[PDB]
Paper text:
Retromer is a master regulator of cargo retrieval from endosomes, which is critical for many cellular processes including signaling, immunity, neuroprotection, and virus infection. The core of retromer is a trimer comprising vacuolar protein sorting (VPS) proteins VPS35, VPS26, and VPS29. Here, we elucidate the structural basis of membrane tubulation and coupled cargo recognition by metazoan and fungal retromer coats assembled with the non–Bin1/Amphiphysin/Rvs (BAR) sorting nexin SNX3 using cryo–electron tomography. The retromer core retains its arched, scaffolding structure but changes its mode of membrane recruitment when assembled with different SNX adaptors, allowing cargo recognition at subunit interfaces.
In fungi, the only known non–BAR-containing SNX adaptor is the SNX3 homolog, Grd19 (13, 19). Arches were arranged in a pseudohelical lattice wound around membrane tubules. The fungal retromer:Grd19 lattice shows less regularity than either the metazoan retromer:SNX3 or the previously described fungal retromer:SNX-BAR lattice. For both metazoan and fungal retromer:SNX3 coat reconstitutions, we included membrane-attached cargo peptides that contain a canonical Øx(L/M) sorting motif (where Ø is an aromatic amino acid and x is any residue). VPS26 forms a homodimer on the membrane by β sheet complementation between the β7 strands of the N subdomains, creating an interface identical to that seen in the retromer:SNX-BAR coat. In the structure presented here, SNX3 binds the core trimer at the interface between VPS26 and VPS35. In the case of retromer:PX coats, membrane bending will be enhanced through a similar local membrane remodeling by the curved subcomplex of a VPS26 homodimer and two SNX3 proteins, while further membrane remodeling derives from insertion of loops from VPS26 and SNX3 into the head group layer of the membrane.
Residue numbers in the entry:
A (entry chain C), B (entry chain A): 12 to 306
C (entry chain L), D (entry chain G): 71 to 186
E (entry chain U), F (entry chain V): 551 to 560
G (entry chain F), H (entry chain J): 5 to 296
Write the structure that this text describes.
Amino acid sequence: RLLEDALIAVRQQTAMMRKFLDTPGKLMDALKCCSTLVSELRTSSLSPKQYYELYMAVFDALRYLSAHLRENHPVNHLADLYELVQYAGNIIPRLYLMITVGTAYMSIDGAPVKELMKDMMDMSRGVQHPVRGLFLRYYLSGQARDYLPTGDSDGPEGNLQDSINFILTNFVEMNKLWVRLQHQGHSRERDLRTQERRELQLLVGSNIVRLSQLVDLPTYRDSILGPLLEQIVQCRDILAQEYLLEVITQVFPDEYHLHTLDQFLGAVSRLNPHVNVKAIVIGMMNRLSDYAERE
Amino acid sequence: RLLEDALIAVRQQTAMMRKFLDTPGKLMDALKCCSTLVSELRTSSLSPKQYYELYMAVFDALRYLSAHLRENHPVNHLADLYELVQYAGNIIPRLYLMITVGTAYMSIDGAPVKELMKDMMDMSRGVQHPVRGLFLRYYLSGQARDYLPTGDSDGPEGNLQDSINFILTNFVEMNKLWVRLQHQGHSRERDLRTQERRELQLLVGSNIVRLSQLVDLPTYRDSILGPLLEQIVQCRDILAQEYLLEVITQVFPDEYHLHTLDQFLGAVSRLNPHVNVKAIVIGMMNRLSDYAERE
Amino acid sequence: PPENFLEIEVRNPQTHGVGRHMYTDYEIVCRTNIPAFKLRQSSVRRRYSDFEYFRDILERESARVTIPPLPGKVFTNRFSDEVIENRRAGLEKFLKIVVGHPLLQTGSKVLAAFVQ
Amino acid sequence: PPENFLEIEVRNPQTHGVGRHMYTDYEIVCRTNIPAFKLRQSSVRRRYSDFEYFRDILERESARVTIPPLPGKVFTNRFSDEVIENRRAGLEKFLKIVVGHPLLQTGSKVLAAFVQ
Amino acid sequence: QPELYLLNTM
Amino acid sequence: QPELYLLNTM
Amino acid sequence: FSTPVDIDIVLADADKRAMVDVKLDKNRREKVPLYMDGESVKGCVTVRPKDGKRLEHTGIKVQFIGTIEMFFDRGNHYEFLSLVQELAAPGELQHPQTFDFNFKNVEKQYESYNGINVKLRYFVRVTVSRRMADVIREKDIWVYSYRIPPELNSSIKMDVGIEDCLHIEFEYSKSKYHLKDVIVGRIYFLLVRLKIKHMELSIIRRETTGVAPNQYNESETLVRFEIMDGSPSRGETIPIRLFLGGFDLTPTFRDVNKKFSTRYYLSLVLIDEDARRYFKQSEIILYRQPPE
Amino acid sequence: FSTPVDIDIVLADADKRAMVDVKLDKNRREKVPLYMDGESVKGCVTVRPKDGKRLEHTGIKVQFIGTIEMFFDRGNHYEFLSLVQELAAPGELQHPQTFDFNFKNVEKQYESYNGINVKLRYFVRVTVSRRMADVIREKDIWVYSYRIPPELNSSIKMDVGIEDCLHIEFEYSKSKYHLKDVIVGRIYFLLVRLKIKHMELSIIRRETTGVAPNQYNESETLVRFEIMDGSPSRGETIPIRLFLGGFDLTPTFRDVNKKFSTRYYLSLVLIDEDARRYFKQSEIILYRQPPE
């Protein structure tokens, strides 16, 4: 009931936001309708699938908003708009708006991109509710996907370290939330929570894919696997260990792994026997066997 | 009696004035009493002899006051006293005080000589009574006839010409007053008026005496006798013509007269047929006879 | 004569008649050189009721100043020597004040007609 | 157990006696891990007037908050099956609200003593 | 109705 | 008591 | 009939002078000319007669008034500035007439305010005096009070809590903020043993009216601004960025004419799962910045 | 007992500020501080308690007042300037206390005047409010009004007389004279057919009080100054030099607050032998010169 009624309200708000978006100087009214739409996300009675689908509808409206802002800056501006959008009363609409305006700022002015990422990354320290913070940070990852300062940068200030910091910090905060999915909510929903974690694993692994479309082999050895191994060895969780290690193996190349083999094997030595290390080890060892038989 | 009542008041006022002159800071009280005394000279009811006697008694007291002022300025000062004496309520006392202070200023202050003397002479033109103004001009003459802007000036205010102008102007005003004596009072007291005029002839001739302590023959010709002859022939009276011409002849030098003999005879021709020309001509010829007999 | 002068007197009383309409009149003698008069010496006769009538005319012509009252009507003995003299002296004094007043001398036409 | 919990119920009514002083009591079964309780499982017996006395003590200890009233005194048939059940259900609901209140859980000493 | 507790300085 | 006459302009 | 006479006031700078808004009861917005302290007030009083009759009067004057009105009580009005110009003496009016006026360099010590128990307003009052009932026209103006950047502006930083239960350090970047300024701050959690559902930062306006024990405090909660959703742990830092320009506030007014204060407070509020509410109030001074 | 409290007012510039005199009824001379238009008035209100008791009060204030008082009537007083500073709120006094005050750049549009039907005075009034009877202290000041040399100053020159009797031309050097200036003039005789005993020049002060048909004119003959003794003839010129500094006059005040005028006239008087008196009155404007 709630999900479809919310989706109806979302479609109504998208219609009113776009009718406002057509008129310059209705941007604040468009943001008010967008906030009213994201208010639908204040229900928590939706299933993970239902809450996800509502997120998709609000995300789709946000795609319209993000293109509208990335057009408003190219045509006139609104001064201090990143600050001005932080006056929104609803926090989830406000932060989704913060990501949307942020990406508009990265598109309009490349010089503050590095500075804007430090501000935006710092403010992502708010939403610690795993489902809402994960969906918000997924929106962040999709909006902030293409702007990272590095050796693969876009022409903002920034070196390989700024992208490495952005992705590692984003990985650690989302992984902390993703594990917290194991915990958040109520205790009799552990299987539902594990379902939620499997659903949101792509949100975490998008960071690893983004890292692989980032810094190279010496940077991989010093400043990727090290952090990654520290998390792998220190989580003592099972679902995260299998997912995160397989994503590392697949996403980064084995030329990179070969330069990190000893780091890998020093992770291989601490495997906790009551952690379902057997499944992780068989799948990794089988992969290395298959690696061997690509003969 | 009127004279005696006034003289009693004069002695009363002189007694408090002298007690005030004794006390420093009672000088203003002495001047107020002096004004009350000089108010007695404002009467017109006295016989000629009685008014003369009242004037002489008040004049000697005024001499005591005038010497007191002419000593006070030489030893310290009295500020604005020339202005201060113009404060007096009674005009005849007021004007006598301005003459007294004027002469005190003339003794103390050499620089203002022309302006203060010219001022005192011009403002004494206010006197609308012939007798009182004539007696006032004796107070002036006793005060300042000896101080005139004259050759005693060595470059600042005043020159022998200024004194000549001052005295000639004084002559014209005294002569207008002298004829006006003829016309004051009732017409049937004409012989009494002529007697009074005979009494006051010395008043006119003191100016001639003052003139004979002055400039030489070319200056006599241009700026004394010339002026004097137009006035002598146009005044058209008898007592003044006989008196003034004989006083001029004795008092001014005959060396000067010799250079001006023809001017005299042309004045003798410029007289009324109805003035006592016989007496003037007989007296002139008799004087020329003296110009013949002094062996 | 440079001066302006006026001299006046009320004198020489005379009593006239045959019976009915008996009356007395007084001579007014005046000498003047004032520019509102037409001759140097005037001599005229006037009785008491002429003075009374003159006063009303003078007060009305004036429209203005204080005119003294006349010595008065007499009911007791108008033809007695003392009474005639008392009145003559009062008329003499009254007339000298009226004709002596500077504004009446220069402005009063009625005054000039009473004298001349 | 990271979470703090308390479960409580009022059940198992029993009526006791030989004649005089006949009464019924109810079992209070509670399970908890709250830091103000001294054992995990408590099982105690309480009659209706124990609940009445507990309420006065609780209201006085609170010096403060709203405590719901108890289901009520009964004058008609206190030992009837339906009456015992009506009361048991009302005591069960009352007790769950009182012990469920966060401030009573952390601050009430009287509550802990009634349960244990 | 809803409890309101002032936070004290330390 | 004492007459007072205003002087007129000409 | 109608009125025999109508009084209008036209300022000399009426075309070029800026105007400002004021919020009044039931959400009404009036708009009046803007003035500052030290400015001269000058213009024309324009009298429009309406009837072919005659208006007998015992004088016409114009007053510049600044006054404080308390509790809507007419007996409790206090004029703190009154300047008079007499425009006409006792007489008649038969036809229209204008009268010039100038009040030289007019002091205007306070800013205009409309509140609950207090009004502070400035106006021009034209009075045509009559035998039993004056013709009076008021003509409201707004006065603003400007202040430069303050010499001392320190950050507000405080450790506060409930013993062995909640300990937090809060930091706000300034003690004094302008009307379009930004509250930049943070909340740092040192001890959390309570279950926190959410946290919000509220701006509270207190209007204080009266003298000594006669004190009435009206309190209005202008904003409730959420800054945290969900339960933090120790070592967590929550950022605050709250833009004051979204809520249209008045400056902080302190002891105005010794009759009222209008004061602003940041009230930080944390709410537990059972809806218990933990708070800390801190005064902030608001000020009207001068543009260049 | 005595008074429980005494109020004294001490100006900040009390040592160095100039004072001036005022003539009052029965030849009295008071002396008060001198002020000018635009000057600030500032100092201390010093309260001296006298008893070891307590003084309960409902507020202490100081007022700067400028007012016009007519006919000595308290109902006919008109304040043209009133400025207030509140010095204390409702409360108690047990011991001595001083209170600072500053009235910034005080307008003072008129000069102080004491006349017959009019007073214009300026003062500081301190009021300690009490339940049935205030403690009030007034503290008088003098305000002067200064004016530069006038742009247009023409000579006064007029032919006047009585037809075919007296014709005279009089000349006075200015129409506007300062308070220590000199009437320089002359009288020229064109026709004399009357016998003139003397001539004097008189300064007359007229104080005019009221509005419209309500007009009271008080007239004071300040000087009688003789300028001619005896009978002139035609072609005669009489000089006038009359120093105004000998008579201590006020400036010409014209329609002050639309309530009074103080005006000065030169009245030239000629007297005949029978004591008839011929005259011509001419207004002159007096003004207070500013020293450099």
